[PDB]
UniProtKB/Swiss-Prot annotation, chain A:
Protein name per Swiss-Prot or TrEMBL: Cellular tumor antigen p53
Resulting phenotype, residue 88 to S: In sporadic cancers; somatic mutation
Encoding gene, per UniProt annotation: TP53
Effect of residue 12 to V: In sporadic cancers; somatic mutation
Residues of the full protein shown: 94 to 292 of 393
Effect of residue 177 to C: In sporadic cancers; somatic mutation
Reported effect, residue 31 to W: In a sporadic cancer; somatic mutation
Effect of residue 88 to H: In LFS; germline mutation and in sporadic cancers; somatic mutation
Record note on what altering residue 144 to I does: In LFS; germline mutation and in sporadic cancers; somatic mutation
Natural source organism: Homo sapiens
From Swiss-Prot, chain B:
SUPFAM superfamilies assigned to the protein according to its UniProt record, in alphabetical order: Hect, E3 ligase catalytic domain
Region annotated E6-binding, chain positions: 218-235
Disease annotated for this entry: Angelman syndrome: A neurodevelopmental disorder characterized by severe motor and intellectual retardation, ataxia, frequent jerky limb movements and flapping of the arms and hands, hypotonia, seizures, absence of speech, frequent smiling and episodes of paroxysmal laughter, open-mouthed expression revealing the tongue.
Note: A cysteine residue is required for ubiquitin-thioester formation.
Top-level EC class: transferase
Locations listed in the record: Cytoplasm; Nucleus
Name recorded for this polypeptide: Ubiquitin-protein ligase E3A
Result for mutant: residue 428 to P: May be associated with AS
From Swiss-Prot, chain C:
Gene: E6
A matching Pfam family: E6
Organism, scientific name: Human papillomavirus type 16
Protein name: Protein E6
Zinc finger (unnamed): 30-66, 103-139
Keyword Nucleotide-binding: no
Biological role stated in the UniProt entry: Plays a major role in the induction and maintenance of cellular transformation. Acts mainly as an oncoprotein by stimulating the destruction of many host cell key regulatory proteins. E6 associates with host UBE3A/E6-AP ubiquitin-protein ligase, and inactivates tumor suppressors TP53 and TP73 by targeting them to the 26S proteasome for degradation. In turn, DNA damage and chromosomal instabilities increase and lead to cell proliferation and cancer development.
Length: 199, 692, 143
């Protein structure tokens, strides 16, 4: 079946992870992050990256798979599907298959993998040192997907859990992942913070 | 008439043909025009002498067969340099093409510009254009200086130094005009720094001979890993800073072992004794990058000025700690004593210090760095240093006294060392460390005979051939003799791998470096491994625990302070032990008088003459008898503040000097024979009386 | 109770899930003030993006009132690059953020309205080791 790994926190001895930048909760300021609830509201099809760093020099060269697993269990086994409106329309770059939400623009070393372990095409994420030392790693990921296309869209969140495959038998890369494309792309975050802090 | 404008770059054959044509026509004007055209632009020199290397080696010999070429050279080198400034500030020429390191080579190979007429606008402007250069080009140029003979690199370092001397004699320096606001002197200093790094690379530098920091899990201060709680990772701490060129070459000032020329040579005294460091420290630590911090050159400054900077660091440290603690007591309401009042008994001083200072240091290791206000029991008063000085000296002497068995003495070099194989308690070697740090920070002489090894491995080093040749150079010479021994050691002395190892009771204990140390014969097919293993085990790995405790104490009294590289191993000694050189003229010119007696008094003149009647040994023994230390204070006899007061009239009642304040209250006597006899008796009975 | 080195949790809202809790059932204990968690303290901890590390094995949180207690000690003692030129633009490959650091005074990575708040004063800026710290809304005036 489409069993999913547990939601844990496995960083490791060497600390490579994201780092997010906050500039305010203005209407037009979407190059930011939710400091409290750890939520991404960045505008769709917009360039909103905020800086990049890494500890010293992690060894790159191997691609690590990462599948966008849902949260609610009634469709935990569901296979992620691109929006039919985006699938049929000619809006991609041609190389992007009409079955993936992944638009690799913050990096260049990620390719779609037709994984048949659970009938789920799990695209790999670029495991590379960003800028090799600086401040607040934020790899640029912007998704163009509308999840209310009266089909298998069933508006819902998808979480990009990182799975590391290498020479060793251990699977690494378990962080506080966050990927959303539906509902409001950017805008402010104070209102969602307030209406979620009461629940 | 041929203008010779069909040729734009100079080579050996073409210049030879030009010279032949000029000689045949007996006219130097075409040659002057050609040389001016060539030296009017940078690209002409860029394409010049392009090999299809001895051209620069041989052509310059025949350039100097006349006189009219030097007048053209002067204005050519005045004009050319600003073009190089334009081509170096924002042009990235070295990035575009590595074939750019010929211009300054040609400009600098001529060993004749050093005439004083050039060194007003020709070579100073060349130095201004040399100040800016891509950071890899500086290193690449330095490689060829390093891989070269010592004589000519020496010659150019004196020509740069005498240029520096010429300006510092010419230019004026004061508070409103420091020695840094002038760009020419700063640029000359930078190029001299380049020559410095070349010369240090010339010596037999070393990096494997650097003992790794076998630091125990020192009690951390939660404000260091609070940052890791703030969200960062294990920070490469912004503490100790390193010169960028040191990173480029992988060469540190500490790495030098035996240089081609003594490092004292680089000390530019005319600049050095006109330099102020009280505000130079501010220019340095905050790192304002429009000025040059001469501490970045740890070679152009001497003992006194660096020590002034270190003291200023301690002063600003105490200022910051008080600024923090006033608000700490305002809010948290906790009581802290800024004075390090180590109030102890008269005979339990060591153990009282153990039970108080270590406790006050575990809470805050920066408390050791503070100022100490010693207050004994039975006497009271404002301690200006006399009680502190006697505390320090009695601590050292009782530790020097073999009643504890932890400080040993050798008559070969008159130096005090630790016990090689003691079984001490780690607290015993912690008051030595804290007292030593205070002496470095109390501006007080600490009578001690620590060799260079202490001040070196206390800096982060190991010790080497010359460091071994400080206590027992006889073993050094014995192994140096065996170094060139081409015979068979096995068939001559059949000595095993082990030799000996000293202990407390003198027993020749069993100690094999490896397994079967007494069963492995000496092999002559290799000697360097013997050298390396000896330089390891006989120089370290024997006082690991005890000296580890001592070094821990010193590092916890001074860890956050610019002391790791400003002072070389051969430099912190003068801060506490005393100046080796004993020049009496310094004492004469630096004299402070009191007691109401005029400086022009004949009595003082004959007293000084009586002192002159003594020799160097007698002078130093007199200094030991009076001041209490056998060496002159920091800065020698020309930097202290000695006080001459009056005890009373001409009478032999009680001639006594206030040792607490180092005031020589010598009685005023008329007859000279009585003065000579009394002084001879005082010299003969100096430390046997037990007064000091 | 969490002695795993490689599995160390970072964020308290991130730890909110695997502790069998939706948003408001976390109960832990601090270290530097030795007290139970506070809802406002949880909000402020989420307002500064800390990183919980285990103390003597037990991972514990950090309070809010202790903000200016172990941080004010290192704002006037150690000093380094204090310019807005190239003083941290070439010594490292990637220069810097827009104006974000790991702050010591405002203590969150970047406050929204703190870009020019210091610039309006120009009184001994505390650029410590090259970090452009600012001031937060919880410590604006004298409290």
């Amino acid at each position: 079946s489409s069993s999913v790994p547990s939601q844990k926190t496995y960083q490791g001895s060497y600390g490579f992870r994201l780092g997010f930048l906050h500039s305010g909760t203005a209407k037009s300021v979407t190059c930011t992050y939710s400091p409290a609830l750890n939520k991404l509201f960045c505008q769709l099809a917009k360039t909103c990256p905020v800086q990049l760093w890494v500890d010293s020099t992690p060894p790159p060269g191997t691609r690590v798979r990462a599948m966008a697993i849902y949260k609610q269990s009634q469709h935990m086994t569901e296979v992620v599907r691109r929006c039919p409106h985006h699938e049929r329309c000619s809006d991609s770059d041609g190389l992007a298959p009409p079955q993936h939400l992944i638009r690799v623009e913050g990096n260049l070393r990620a390719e779609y993998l037709d994984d048949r372990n659970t009938f789920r095409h799990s695209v790999v994420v670029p495991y590379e040192p960003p800028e090799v030392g600086s401040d607040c790693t934020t790899i640029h990921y912007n998704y163009m997907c509308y999840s209310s296309c009266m089909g298998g869209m069933n508006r819902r969140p998808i979480l990009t859990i990182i799975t590391l495959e290498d020479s060793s038998g251990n699977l690494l890369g378990r962080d506080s992942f966050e990927v959303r494309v539906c509902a409001c792309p950017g805008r402010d975050r104070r209102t969602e913070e307030e209406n979620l802090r009461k629940k | 008439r041929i203008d010779f404008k069909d040729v734009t770059y100079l080579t050996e054959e073409k210049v030879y043909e030009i010279l032949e044509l000029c000689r045949e026509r007996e006219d130097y004007s075409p040659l002057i025009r050609v040389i001016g055209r060539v030296f009017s632009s940078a690209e002409a020199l860029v394409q010049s002498f392009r090999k299809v290397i001895d051209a620069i080696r041989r052509v310059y010999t025949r350039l100097l067969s006349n006189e009219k070429i030097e007048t053209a050279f002067l204005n050519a080198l005045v004009y050319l340099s600003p073009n190089v400034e334009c081509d170096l500030t924002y042009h990235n020429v070295y990035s575009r093409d590595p074939n750019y390191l010929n211009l300054f080579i040609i400009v600098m190979e001529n060993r004749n510009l050093h005439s004083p007429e050039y060194l007003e606008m020709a070579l100073p402007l060349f130095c201004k254009a040399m100040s800016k250069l891509p950071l890899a080009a500086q290193g690449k140029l330095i490689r060829l200086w390093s891989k070269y003979n010592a004589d000519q690199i020496r010659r150019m370092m004196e020509t740069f130094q005498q240029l520096i001397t010429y300006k510092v004699i010419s230019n004026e320096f004061n508070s409103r005009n420091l020695v840094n606001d002038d760009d020419a002197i700063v640029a000359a200093s930078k190029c001299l720094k380049m020559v410095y790094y070349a010369n240090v690379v010339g010596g037999e530098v070393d990096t494997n001979h650097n003992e790794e920091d076998d630091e125990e899990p020192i009690p951390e201060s939660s404000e260091l890993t609070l940052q890791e709680l703030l969200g960062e990772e294990r920070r490469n701490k912004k503490g100790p800073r390193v010169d960028p060129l040191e990173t480029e070459l992988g060469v540190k000032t500490l790495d030098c072992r035996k240089p081609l020329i003594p490092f004292e040579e680089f000390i530019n005294e005319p600049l050095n004794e006109v330099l102020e460091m009280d505000k130079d420290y501010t220019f340095f630590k905050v790192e304002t990058e429009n000025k040059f911090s001469f501490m970045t050159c740890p070679f152009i400054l001497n003992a006194v000025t660096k020590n002034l900077g270190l003291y200023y660091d301690n002063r600003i440290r105490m200022y910051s700690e008080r600024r923090i603690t006033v608000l700490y007591s305002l809010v948290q309401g906790q009581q802290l004593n800024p004075y390090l009042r180590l109030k102890v008994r008269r005979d339990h001083i060591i153990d009282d210090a153990l039970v108080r200072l270590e406790m006050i240091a575990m809470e805050n290791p920066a408390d050791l760095k503070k100022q100490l206000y010693v207050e004994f029991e039975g006497e009271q008063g404002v301690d200006e240093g006399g009680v502190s000085k006697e505390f320090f000296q009695l601590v050292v002497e009782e530790i020097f006294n073999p009643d504890i068995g932890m400080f040993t003495y050798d008559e070969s070099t008159k130096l005090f060392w630790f016990n090689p194989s003691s079984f001490e308690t780690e607290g015993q070697f912690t008051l030595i460390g804290i007292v030593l740090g205070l002496a470095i920070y109390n501006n007080c002489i600490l009578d001690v005979h620590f060799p260079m090894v202490v001040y070196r491995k206390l800096m982060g080093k190991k010790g080497t051939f010359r460091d071994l040749g400080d206590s027992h150079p006889v073993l050094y010479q014995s192994l140096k003799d065996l170094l060139e021994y081409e015979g068979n050691v096995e068939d001559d002395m059949m000595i095993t791998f082990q030799i000996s190892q000293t202990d407390l009771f003198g027993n020749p204990m069993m100690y094999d470096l490896k397994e079967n140390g007494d069963k492995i014969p000496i092999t002559n097919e290799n000697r360097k491994e013997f050298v390396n293993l000896y330089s390891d085990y006989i120089l370290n790995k024997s006082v690991e625990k005890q000296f580890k405790a001592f070094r821990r104490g010193f590092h916890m009294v001074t860890n956050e302070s610019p002391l790791k590289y400003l002072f070389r191993p051969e430099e912190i000694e003068l801060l506490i032990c005393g100046s080796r050189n004993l020049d009496f003229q310094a004492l004469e010119e630096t004299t402070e008088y009191d007691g109401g007696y005029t400086r022009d008094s004949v009595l003082i003149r004959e007293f000084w003459e009586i002192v002159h009647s003594f020799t160097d040994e007698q002078k130093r023994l007199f200094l030991q008898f009076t001041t209490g230390t056998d060496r002159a204070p920091v800065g020698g006899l020309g930097k202290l503040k000695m006080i001459i007061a009056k005890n009373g009239p001409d009478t032999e009642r009680l001639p006594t000097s206030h040792t607490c304040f180092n005031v020589l209250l010598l009685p005023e006597y008329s007859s000279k024979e009585k003065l000579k006899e009394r002084l001879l008796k005082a010299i003969t009975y100096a430390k046997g009386f037990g007064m000091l | 109770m969490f002695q795993d080195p490689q599995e160390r949790p970072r964020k308290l809202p991130q730890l909110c899930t695997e502790l069998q809790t939706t948003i408001h059932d976390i109960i832990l204990e601090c270290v530097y003030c030795k007290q139970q968690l506070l809802r406002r303290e949880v909000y402020d901890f989420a307002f500064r993006d800390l990183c919980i590390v285990y103390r003597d094995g037990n991972p514990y949180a950090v309070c809010d009132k202790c903000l200016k207690f172990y941080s004010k000690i290192s704002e006037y003692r150690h000093y380094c690059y204090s310019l807005y030129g190239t003083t941290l633009e070439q010594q490292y490959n990637k220069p810097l953020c827009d104006l974000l650091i790991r702050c010591i005074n405002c203590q969150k990575p970047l406050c929204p309205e703190e870009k020019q708040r210091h610039l309006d004063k120009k009184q001994r800026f505390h650029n410590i080791r090259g970090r452009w710290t600012g001031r937060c809304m919880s410590c604006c005036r004298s409290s």
